[PDB]
Amino acid sequence: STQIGGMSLDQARTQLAPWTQRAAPIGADEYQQRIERARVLMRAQGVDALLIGAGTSLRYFSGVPWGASERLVALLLTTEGDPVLICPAFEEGSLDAVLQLPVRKRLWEEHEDPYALVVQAMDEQHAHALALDPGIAFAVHTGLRAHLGTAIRDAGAIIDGCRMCKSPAELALMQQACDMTLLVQRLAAGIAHEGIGTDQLVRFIDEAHRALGADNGSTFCIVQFGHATAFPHGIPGVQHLRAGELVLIDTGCTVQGYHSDITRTWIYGTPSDAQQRIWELELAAQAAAFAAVRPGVACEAVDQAARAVLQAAGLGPDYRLPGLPHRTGHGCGLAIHEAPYLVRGNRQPLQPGMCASNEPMIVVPGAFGVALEDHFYVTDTGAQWFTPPSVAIDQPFA
Amino acid sequence: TQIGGMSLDQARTQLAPWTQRAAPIGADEYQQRIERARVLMRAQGVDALLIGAGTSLRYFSGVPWGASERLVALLLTTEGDPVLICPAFEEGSLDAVLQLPVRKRLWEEHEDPYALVVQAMDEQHAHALALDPGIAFAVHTGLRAHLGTAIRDAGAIIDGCRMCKSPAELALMQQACDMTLLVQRLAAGIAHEGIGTDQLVRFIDEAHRALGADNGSTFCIVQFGHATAFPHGIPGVQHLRAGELVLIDTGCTVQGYHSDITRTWIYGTPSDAQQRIWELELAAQAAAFAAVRPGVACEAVDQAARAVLQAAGLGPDYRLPGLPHRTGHGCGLAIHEAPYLVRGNRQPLQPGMCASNEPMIVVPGAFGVALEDHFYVTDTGAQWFTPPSVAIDQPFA
Ligand SMILES: [Zn+2]
Ligand SMILES: [Zn+2]
Ligand SMILES: [Zn+2]
Ligand SMILES: [Zn+2]
Ligand SMILES: [Zn+2]
Ligand SMILES: [Zn+2]
Ligand SMILES: [Zn+2]
Numbered sequence A: 001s002t003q004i005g006g007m008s009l010d011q012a013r014t015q016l017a018p019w020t021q022r023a024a025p026i027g028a029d030e031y032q033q034r035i036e037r038a039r040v041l042m043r044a045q046g047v048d049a050l051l052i053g054a055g056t057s058l059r060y061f062s063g064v065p066w067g068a069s070e071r072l073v074a075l076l077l078t079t080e081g082d083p084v085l086i087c088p089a090f091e092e093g094s095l096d097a098v099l100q101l102p103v104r105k106r107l108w109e110e111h112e113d114p115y116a117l118v119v120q121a122m123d124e125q126h127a128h129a130l131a132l133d134p135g136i137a138f139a140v141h142t143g144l145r146a147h148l149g150t151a152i153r154d155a156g157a158i159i160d161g162c163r164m165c166k167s168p169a170e171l172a173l174m175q176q177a178c179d180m181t182l183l184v185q186r187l188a189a190g191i192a193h194e195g196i197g198t199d200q201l202v203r204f205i206d207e208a209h210r211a212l213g214a215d216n217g218s219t220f221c222i223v224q225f226g227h228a229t230a231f232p233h234g235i236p237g238v239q240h241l242r243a244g245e246l247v248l249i250d251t252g253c254t255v256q257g258y259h260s261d262i263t264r265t266w267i268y269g270t271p272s273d274a275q276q277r278i279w280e281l282e283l284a285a286q287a288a289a290f291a292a293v294r295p296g297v298a299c300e301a302v303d304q305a306a307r308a309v310l311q312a313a314g315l316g317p318d319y320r321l322p323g324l325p326h327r328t329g330h331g332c333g334l335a336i337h338e339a340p341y342l343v344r345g346n347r348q349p350l351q352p353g354m355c356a357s358n359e360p361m362i363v364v365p366g367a368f369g370v371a372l373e374d375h376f377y378v379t380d381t382g383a384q385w386f387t388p389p390s391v392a393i394d395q396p397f398a
Numbered sequence B: 001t002q003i004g005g006m007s008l009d010q011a012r013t014q015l016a017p018w019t020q021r022a023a024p025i026g027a028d029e030y031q032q033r034i035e036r037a038r039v040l041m042r043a044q045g046v047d048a049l050l051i052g053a054g055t056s057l058r059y060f061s062g063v064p065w066g067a068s069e070r071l072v073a074l075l076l077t078t079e080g081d082p083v084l085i086c087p088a089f090e091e092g093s094l095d096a097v098l099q100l101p102v103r104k105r106l107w108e109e110h111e112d113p114y115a116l117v118v119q120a121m122d123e124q125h126a127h128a129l130a131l132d133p134g135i136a137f138a139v140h141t142g143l144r145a146h147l148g149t150a151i152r153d154a155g156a157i158i159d160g161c162r163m164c165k166s167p168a169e170l171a172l173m174q175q176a177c178d179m180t181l182l183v184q185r186l187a188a189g190i191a192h193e194g195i196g197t198d199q200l201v202r203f204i205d206e207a208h209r210a211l212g213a214d215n216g217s218t219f220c221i222v223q224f225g226h227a228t229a230f231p232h233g234i235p236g237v238q239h240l241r242a243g244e245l246v247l248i249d250t251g252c253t254v255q256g257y258h259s260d261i262t263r264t265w266i267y268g269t270p271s272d273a274q275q276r277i278w279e280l281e282l283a284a285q286a287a288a289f290a291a292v293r294p295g296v297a298c299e300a301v302d303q304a305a306r307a308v309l310q311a312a313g314l315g316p317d318y319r320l321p322g323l324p325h326r327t328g329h330g331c332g333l334a335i336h337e338a339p340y341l342v343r344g345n346r347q348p349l350q351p352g353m354c355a356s357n358e359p360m361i362v363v364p365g366a367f368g369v370a371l372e373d374h375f376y377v378t379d380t381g382a383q384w385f386t387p388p389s390v391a392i393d394q395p396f397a
Helices: A009-013 A028-045 A056-062 A089-098 A114-124 A138-145 A156-163 A168-191 A198-211 A226-230 A273-291 A299-312 B008-012 B027-044 B055-061 B088-095 B113-123 B137-144 B155-162 B167-190 B197-211 B225-229 B272-291 B298-311
Strands: A049-053 A074-078 A084-088 A104-108 A130-132 A152-154 A220-225 A245-252 A262-268 A329-331 A338-342 A355-358 A362-364 A368-370 A374-378 A383-385 B048-052 B073-077 B083-087 B103-107 B129-131 B151-153 B219-224 B244-251 B261-267 B328-330 B337-341 B354-357 B361-363 B367-369 B373-377 B382-384
Touching (some): A028 A049, A028 A056, A028 A156, A074 A114, A084 A089, A084 A114, A089 A104, A104 A114, A130 A138, A138 B137, A138 B151, A152 B137, A168 A374, A198 A245, A226 A245, A245 A368, A273 A355, A273 A368, B027 B055, B027 B155, B055 B073, B073 B113, B088 B103, B103 B113, B167 B197, B167 B373, B197 B219, B197 B244, B219 B225, B225 B367, B244 B367, B272 B354, B272 B361, B337 B354
Parallel strands (some): A084 A104, A130 A152, B048 B129
Antiparallel strands (some): A245 A262, A329 A338, A329 A355, B048 B073, B073 B083, B361 B367, B373 B382
């Protein structure tokens, strides 16, 4: 019982120095490797032009970390030559400061049509088969259609085909984000006390993430007590902690854009027999999902392995409650959620380097939920946890 | 006096939660918004409207969630309660935030939610879908998978609703702006030699929270000295020096409605160039405002700011020193929305429309001066949400 409650705030703060032995940032050669990979997958799908919008995919291919806006900022990759970077002219200086890939800047002034620029660049290289970023706003399709009459493919297969398998450098940045958030999770359980507010934990978790050297504090944070733990993504309203209540904390940060995403569920005080049984079951379901992971295995097979555990114990089947109402997991990288998804119907075979979450949450309607979440990556022979799973309902940390 | 002189503790004495808070949007108003979209659909020959999670779903239904890879959407047709497409597992969380009566169509994880959209269309003999232009392109792919018919862009329908704000919408934006204006005042107040950009950003977030914003600072740009020449700034912490301009662009939300205010002021003594360019910026912003009245095109407001700059020998067009980007953007449940105060936009301003007025001057290699205050259009002219600055060393009226 040494992990829950024993700690005061500035006592926690003494363990919040900036992270050391930081992982190296992605280098210029790796960006080029990603471009070349995209080109292979473009050729495979019969595509000769690829438009990537501002967001995690632009960051992946070029280093530009900006969120998307109403203004088109995009990378147009074609079969050869430096890719074109379409960008508002007033942003050129900011752009140069973040670009990690050599490009050919095509700048547009505010009243000019940036979609016209994209097609002009396509015509220059005689590209006539575009694949468009599935994350880009629909407005961009509308813009391109005024100028482009040929088929516009969904670039999802190409983008996933690149991003799903992580390089050692990517794994190391993810590892760093995970090690940090694990510590934040540990300290959050430490300072928990009777009456503490959910808002207080959220705020501490953000503070901790910042102190440890995350990109931007907490990426997200879900904290729920007692019966509120039955809602997987939570509900509005501040709670205050009472003995006997489960505490669910799902949170993460980013390091150079790469996400951690960890959930811990633990008891504050004495657990009921119901809470203990469901907690142990959650641990076993997560364990089973992990044990099913090796190269070649269909993603849905991992989801099924977790459900098989629940069913054997009289929960489920399928998504029936009490049981697991959502997928077992999601891929994770530069985005909090990305391919491959650990979900029924997904026949995608797992390959070394693939990163996904393992979080087969059990919901007991009207009562509580137990969610344990740690991420893994696929190895040559099996899997490797980014963070080791919890041990007991009152021992969230291995 | 407005710049410096205030300690952090004295600043915090002014940070009680906001009082005289504006009312949240009522059930009746969400229904009015739906009815407006319906006539806009009819005006356009559209009989189905799909709205994705985001500021537009919040606008029509009250649901505030960010978009995800899982479709969460509102399908509006010509009659009946609109359909809400949503993951089955989210139904509980959904019920806690929905402000509109809907017909739920829930999908399990392995099921095709786009199939549910098209089934709902088929049941109502709808064949003319307009799609939310803010939605992920993956949704277009998913719907096209099931539709051989045209999929139109829903921009005109959505803007046709959102551009003109109701009195309740104005009051929520007004509160957010009043809050952020005070945060701007306190930020200028605690300024001192050596203070970091990172420290100002943290205080401004802390302040927005204490005041009762939705989620601290929505965003925050703080630049010093030469760094003020970059409209959206650049990486790196700075520490304040005498003789440097400070630019602060920040905002919060209240019930989702945005503030968005920029102040640029001198710490210490300004140079002649800084003073002249500061004055010119106030004048450009003033002229843009004076141009606003019903019927005036958005581009004419942008042109009024540019004409001031060109008269003074800056520009023309976007040439620097001058104004490298548009004069402003609409603002509401989104930080950026229609109508845009930009060349080429012939959209006439009408009463209720809300927009920023921020004709920033950039002086390459030297500095930039940005003043930003938002306004709404009235029957005869315009009304500031916040009053413009007075001088380079008096950021607040
Ligand atoms: Zn959710
Ligand atoms: Zn999570
Ligand atoms: Zn997760
Ligand atoms: Zn997601
Ligand atoms: Zn920017
Ligand atoms: Zn602004
Ligand atoms: Zn603005």
